[PDB]
Each structure stands twice: as C-alpha cells, then as structure tokens.
Amino acid sequence: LGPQMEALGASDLLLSEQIRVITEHRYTPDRLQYKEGMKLADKIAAQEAALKEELKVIYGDNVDVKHFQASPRTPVQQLFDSLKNAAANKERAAKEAAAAASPYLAYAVTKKQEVQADPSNIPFDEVLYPQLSEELLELELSDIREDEIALEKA
Amino acid sequence: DRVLSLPAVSKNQVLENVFHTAPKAPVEHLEKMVSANSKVYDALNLQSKRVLIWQVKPALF
Amino acid sequence: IEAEAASILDRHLAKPVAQIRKEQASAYASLLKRAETAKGAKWAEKYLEDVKAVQWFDASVAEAPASGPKVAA
Amino acid sequence: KKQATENLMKLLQAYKDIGDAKSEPLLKNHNPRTFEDRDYPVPDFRTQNLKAGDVPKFFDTVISTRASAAIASKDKFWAGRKTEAEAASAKASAAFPRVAVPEWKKGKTVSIENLNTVTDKYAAALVPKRKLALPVLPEGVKKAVEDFAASVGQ
Amino acid sequence: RLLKLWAKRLLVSPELAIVPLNEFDAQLASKFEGISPKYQELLSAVAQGNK
C-alpha cells in the first residue's frame, strides 16, 4: 500500500501533495487516472494558495495551511481572528484616510473598513446558501461512497 | 475490471465543471467604481485641487 | 468642429483607459522634445515658456480652487 | 451593450426561475456525474482479444468514452435548458435597479454629499443578505463584567 | 476498510505484495495464458514459503 497506509486527509503532507503520491503509487504515468489525478492535485493546490492568501493576513507568513485545510476555522474562530486585528485595522484605515489624496477617497477607506471590520459582514456560504454547502458536502461524501461500494463488492 | 464500475467522470472533471468560472468578488465592484468616481470627484467638485472648472469655463477677471 | 470633436471623443471613449494615458503621454513627450530639439528659436523658447505657464495655472488652482488662479490685483 | 446586459440579466433571471420552479439542486446539473449512465452494459475485457500490455489502455478508453458521453449529455441538458430560458427571457419584466453612479448634470458640478451616498450604496452591498449575528462584546459590557470580577478579587 | 481489505489478502496470500499496485493491470490479458510472465514465476515461488 505504501502511501495509501494513511487516509486522504490524515497525512502530514498537504492534501494536494498527498494526491500526487497516491496517484504516483496507484497508477503508472501512461494511465488516464494518473493524468486525471495530477490535474486534481492542481485544483487542490489552487485551493491551498487561495487559503494561504486569505489567512496570511492573520496568522503571518508561516501560516501552516495544513492545519486549516484539514480542519477549517469555525465561525467563532473567524470572529476571534478579526477581533485580534481590529485595533490594528481601525488604526491602519485612519492612517490611510489621513493620507488619502482627496476627501472622496478618505470617506471610501473608512466606509469600506466600517463594513470590513464588522465580523457580522463576513460572508458564510453555509449561511447564505444552505442548499449549496449541503451539496458541496455530498460531492465529497459521494466520492467516498463510491470507494465504499468498491470495497463491499470486493 | 472493478475500475469500470467506478464513475468514469473524474474528480477533476467534477471540480472543473462545478467551479467553471472564478466568481466575482463582492468588493470588486466597490474598489473599481470608487477609483473611477475619484476621477469624478477630482475633475468636477469645486473643492478638489484639480478641478476642470477653470480650464473649461475659464474666468473673467 | 462639433462633428469633429464628437468623432474624436467616440473614438477615444472606445479605448481602454490604460491605452489613453500612454497614447497621450507619448504625444505630449514627443511634442515637448520637438521644442527642446529647437534651441534658440523664438517659437520654441515661447513654447516651453507657455508649458511653464500652464503648470503655474495648475498650481495656482491647487492653492485655492474655489478662487481659481491668483491674478496680481 | 446596455440591452445585451439587460438580456443577460433577464436570461440569468429566467435560469433562476425555471430552476427554482423545478426545485432542483444547485450543483446537480453542473456535476457531470449525474448525467453518467451507471447501468451501461460495461464491456468485458475478456472478450476483446487483448495482449499483455493492452488491458489498461482498454480500461482508459472505456472510461474516457463514458466520461465524454456524460459530459456531452450534460451539454445536451444545458443546450435544452438555454432554449427554455431564452423563450422566457423574451416574455419578461426587466425592472432592474440601475448602477449607482454619482449624479452629474449638464454644466453643473458633482457634490461630495452625493459622491458619498453613492459610496454608501457600494458598501451596503458588501454586507451579506443573510448573515450570522456574530457578537462583539462592547467595552460597555466587557468592562462591567471585568468590574464585577475585580470586585470579587479575580 | 481498505486497510482491512488488504489485511485479509496478505494474511492468506502474502506474495501479492511483490507485484506493485500500479503494475498489476499491465499484466492482464483476455485469456489467462496471455498474462505477462514478469511476475508469474516469481509469485509461484514466493507462495511456496520461506524455505
């Protein structure tokens, strides 16, 4: 089994770099599912750059994106991460509104920050679209159910 | 031939058909219209430092 | 002149704004350099002296935009 | 272009009405797994005269023919969904709100109390139309609790 | 369940660990006599045990 001795989410590598060593192990490079598996590792590495990008504002540059890919932040941890930069965000907007080029732009950096510092304005896709996040779950659960039917047949 | 009982459409081909277009950000409309209305403020306000009112309707001294 | 300016504008409004700023900075800088190539000519001496008087107009308005340019009175 | 954008917004409304009339899931028709035929007669490799290295290339072309026939069946859904919405965007309403731009009259000037209420309309769309009421503890309550905790010596 | 699947297959038939999982489908053919003999004679001798 080799790389398949540990689950898809339960390694120490990032998920996109774990898909690459499962696919290099299950298939040879001439296969269709090797090509479709290394392409999936690009969609997941695209989601890991987009998760590093929207978490480096809080946790620094050594963000440890593996911890937040495996177990994302709860809505109450998304709250308490906005509140721990809200003093440095309201003071940063006040130093741009002082040095904005015109009093139109100075109101626009304190109206955008007045909306972006409120943690009730963080868009939760599960709150906005409840039927979508229950179908984005059943995309990932039906991919596991197809692996479980293949082992009940075996 | 157990692989022929698996769904032939890949996990990749789901993710490229479900997330086909990069979605439009909510703040992308703000920061594009604000930067374009900052030029409406500049040229057309009467309190801006670069107004067009003195080079369009000149003066009478 | 109304029909020339309306066709000049509608051609210019069909450009993206990044093209406009460098088409105009290329035309402004090429026309400055033609007045700086000409040394000693009276017209080029007066051309660059009016560029310094436009920049006075833009700077005198920036000091008091509800007043306009400041004239000696 | 203004009429093309009103046609596209009326089409995108007609897609949303005839999808919400059928009460269908959001990700169902964009998922090409849902157009895949799992009851297909599934060709036996033992009746196709394969040599030693030829069986994985047989498996790839049975899979890629069945993935292409599910994608091309998804395209035949959406090409038929389009004409169902192109024939209802024709008999439509077209009462859309206009883009908030600052009011500029003919020889007049733009006031900053109108450039700012336009920027209020941009930042009032940054709030999500359904949100979590994530509570920030104010200083008026988080000190009155710390007062009560410091009076009992904690 | 995948770890339990291969647990039974390698408790009964531990020689299956000598043909790798990616190079398995490249062995088959339509007839059993057409199966590639790369691992056939090695699997028969690993199956006979450690002596």
Cβ-Cβ contacts under 8 Å, D101 against chain A: none
List the structure tokens of A112: 């955008």
Burial (0-12, 13-18, 19+ Cβ within 10 Å), A33:
buried
Q: What is the 3-state secondary structure (H, E, C) of D63-82?
A: HHHHHHHHHHHHHHHHHHHH
Chains C and B, touching by 3 or more CB pairs within 8 angstroms: yes
Q: Which residues have a Cβ under 8 Å from the Cβ of E34 and sit 6 or more positions away?
A: D50, D51, D52
Task: Say how far apart CA B59 and CA C67 lie, in whole Å.
Answer: 10
- The beta-carbon neighbor of C65 closest among B49, B59, B61 is B49
Task: Give the chain A residue whose CA is nearest to the CA of B41.
Answer: A104
> In chain A, which among 9-68 make CB contacts under 8 A with chain B?
33, 36-37, 39-40, 43
Report yes or no: E41 and D57 within 8 Å, Cβ to Cβ.
no
List the structure tokens of A140: 């990932």
Q: Mutating which of B15, B20, B40 best tests the A interface, going by the most A Cβ atoms within 10 A?
A: B15
Distances (CA, A) of D98 to A104, D102, D116: 22, 12, 17
Q: Which residues have a Cβ under 8 Å from the Cβ of D79 and sit 6 or more positions away?
A: none
Instruction: Compute the CA torsion angle C39, C42, C48, C54 (nearest 10 deg).
Output: 180
Query: In angstroms, what is the C-alpha Rg of chain E?
Result: 12
State how far Cα D123 lies from the chain centre. 21
**A with B: how many residue pairs have Cβ under 8 Å apart?**
53
**In degrees, to the nearest 5, what angle opens at C-alpha A116 toward C-alphas A113 and A121?**
145
Task: Say how far apart CA A81 and CA A77 lie, in whole Å.
Answer: 6
Task: Say how far apart CA D84 and CA D77 lie, in whole Å.
Answer: 11
Handedness of CA A92, A93, A96, A98 (dihedral sign): negative
Report yes or no: D62 and D43 within 8 Å, Cβ to Cβ.
yes
State how far Cα A61 lies from the chain centre. 15
Q: Which residues have a Cβ under 8 Å from the Cβ of E25 and sit 6 or more positions away?
A: D55, D56, D59
Query: In angstroms, what is the C-alpha Rg of chain C?
Result: 17
Q: For the beta carbon of residue D52, count every other beta carbon within 10 angstroms.
A: 14
- The beta-carbon neighbor of C62 closest among B46, B49, B59 is B49
DSSP states of B2-60: GGGTS-SS-HHHHHHHHS-SPPPPSSHHHHHHHHHHHHHHHHSSSSSSS-SHHHHS---
Taking alpha carbons only, the member of B44, C14, A55 closest to residue D101 is B44
Cβ-Cβ contacts under 8 Å, E23 against chain A: 28
Q: Would you call A28 an interface residue with chain D, using a CB distance cutoff of 8 Å?
A: yes
- A9 phi, psi to nearest 5 deg: -105, -10
Q: Which residues have a Cβ under 8 Å from the Cβ of A115 and sit 6 or more positions away?
A: A121, D123, D126, D127
Q: Would you call D12 an interface residue with chain E, using a CB distance cutoff of 8 Å?
A: no
Task: Say how far apart CA A96 and CA D67 lie, in whole Å.
Answer: 53
Report yes or no: D17 and D93 within 8 Å, Cβ to Cβ.
no
DSSP states of D87-101: TTSSS----PPPP--
- Residues in chain C after which the backbone breaks (C–N beyond 2.5 Å): none
Alpha-carbon distance E29 to nearest alpha carbon in chain D (angstroms): 5
End-to-end C-alpha distance for chain E, whole angstroms: 32
Task: Give the chain A residue whose CA is nearest to the CA of E17.
Answer: A1
List the structure tokens of C62: 């920036």
Burial (0-12, 13-18, 19+ Cβ within 10 Å), A150:
middle
Q: Which residues have a Cβ under 8 Å from the Cβ of A104 and sit 6 or more positions away?
A: B37, B38, B41, B45, D112, D115, D116, D119
List the structure tokens of B31: 């920061």
CB contact under 8 A, C61 and B51: yes
Task: Give the chain D residue whose CA is nearest to the CA of E32.
Answer: D46
Alpha-carbon distance D31 to nearest alpha carbon in chain E (angstroms): 27
- A71 phi, psi to nearest 5 deg: -130, 100
Task: Say how far apart CA D95 and CA D112 lie, in whole Å.
Answer: 29
Q: For the beta carbon of residue D74, count every other beta carbon within 10 angstroms.
A: 20
Task: Say how far apart CA D89 and CA D13 lie, in whole Å.
Answer: 8
Report yes or no: D124 and D40 within 8 Å, Cβ to Cβ.
no
Report yes or no: D102 and D118 within 8 Å, Cβ to Cβ.
yes
Task: Say how far apart CA A5 and CA D77 lie, in whole Å.
Answer: 41
Task: Say how far apart CA A68 and CA D112 lie, in whole Å.
Answer: 44
Q: Mutating which of D121, D134, D142 best tests the A interface, going by the most A Cβ atoms within 10 A?
A: D134
Handedness of CA A107, A109, A112, A117 (dihedral sign): negative
Q: Which residues have a Cβ under 8 Å from the Cβ of D107 and sit 6 or more positions away?
A: B57
Helices and strands, counts by H and E, chain D:
4, 0
Taking alpha carbons only, the member of A142, D52, D42, E18 closest to residue B3 is D42
- Largest pairwise CA distance in chain A: 71
Q: Would you call B50 an interface residue with chain C, using a CB distance cutoff of 8 Å?
A: yes
Cβ-Cβ contacts under 8 Å, A135 against chain D: 25-28
- The beta-carbon neighbor of B7 closest among D36, D62, D119 is D36
Report yes or no: B28 and D122 within 8 Å, Cβ to Cβ.
no
Task: Say how far apart CA A88 and CA A111 lie, in whole Å.
Answer: 16
**In degrees, to the nearest 5, what angle opens at C-alpha E32 toward C-alphas E28 and E37?**
60
Q: Would you call E47 an interface residue with chain D, using a CB distance cutoff of 8 Å?
A: no
Q: What is the 3-state secondary structure (H, E, C) of A79-127?
A: HHHHCCCHHHHHHHHHHHHHCCCCHHHHHHHHHHHHHHCCHHHCCCHHH
Task: Please state the length of chain C.
Answer: 73
Q: For the beta carbon of residue B52, count every other beta carbon within 10 angstroms.
A: 14
End-to-end C-alpha distance for chain B, whole angstroms: 94
Q: Where are the alpha helices (DSSP H) in A30-74?
A: 32-53, 56-59, 65-70
Cβ-Cβ contacts under 8 Å, D125 against chain A: none
DSSP states of D10-59: HHHHHHHHHHHTTT--TTTTT-TTTT--TTS----GGGTT--GGGHHHHH
Task: Give the chain B residue whose CA is nearest to the CA of D43.
Answer: B4
Report yes or no: D70 and B8 within 8 Å, Cβ to Cβ.
yes
Task: Say how far apart CA C8 and CA D134 lie, in whole Å.
Answer: 54
Alpha-carbon distance E51 to nearest alpha carbon in chain D (angstroms): 31
Q: How was this structure determined?
A: cryo-EM
